[PDB]
Structures are given as structure tokens and as C-alpha cells.
């Protein structure tokens, strides 16, 4: 043979998935979105009452 031709490199783009995780606790946990941007100081917290006895 001895076909001393031309050589290329073929990087094709069908990725191989490797990681598949689940988050069963965060979905169950409720989300809240208060409009209070002062909490960056970490000394500003929201106070909520507790059912009375």
C-alpha cells in the first residue's frame, strides 16, 4: 500500500453523559422570596411568631 496521505483529527460533538443526581429534599422543602435586601448584613433576620399555647 504505502499510501502516505494526509492525516486529520476528528473531534465530534456527541457528549458522553456521566453525571445524573437527584435532589429529593430541596424539592420537598418550601421556597420563600421576601423583598428584604438588607439581609446582606446578616444581622437583619425575619421574625415569625409561634402558635400560642
Amino acid at each position: 500500500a504505502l499510501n502516505e496521505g494526509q492525516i486529520v483529527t476528528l473531534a465530534v460533538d456527541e457528549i458522553i453523559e456521566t453525571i445524573s443526581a437527584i435532589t429529593p429534599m430541596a424539592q420537598k422543602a418550601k421556597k420563600y422570596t421576601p423583598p428584604a435586601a438588607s439581609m446582606q448584613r446578616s444581622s437583619n433576620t425575619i421574625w415569625m411568631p409561634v402558635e400560642q399555647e
Partner: protein, 45 residues
């Protein structure tokens, strides 16, 4: 090649192209429907 990737690329392109108008329209809807006071950055007092 991937149908998912093609669809997501098209959707992302349109979503990023229509970003400013959508934001302004959402602000207009909130202003006209819920409340004209958007004060959450003003929580330092």
C-alpha cells in the same frame, strides 16, 4: 445534531434577544396591576 440541543439553542437565542423588552413589559404589568412601590433595596432603614 442533537434535537434537544438545537431546540435549546433556538430558545436561548430568542430568550436572550427579547430580554430587555420582556423585563420592561413585566415591570409595566407589575406597576399597573399590583403596586407602584418596588422597595426591597430600600431595606436599610
Amino acid at each position: 445534531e442533537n434535537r434537544l440541543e438545537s431546540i435549546l439553542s433556538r430558545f436561548d437565542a430568542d430568550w436572550t434577544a427579547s430580554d430587555e423588552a420582556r423585563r420592561e413589559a413585566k415591570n409595566d404589568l407589575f406597576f399597573s396591576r399590583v403596586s407602584q412601590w418596588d422597595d426591597w433595596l430600600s431595606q436599610y432603614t
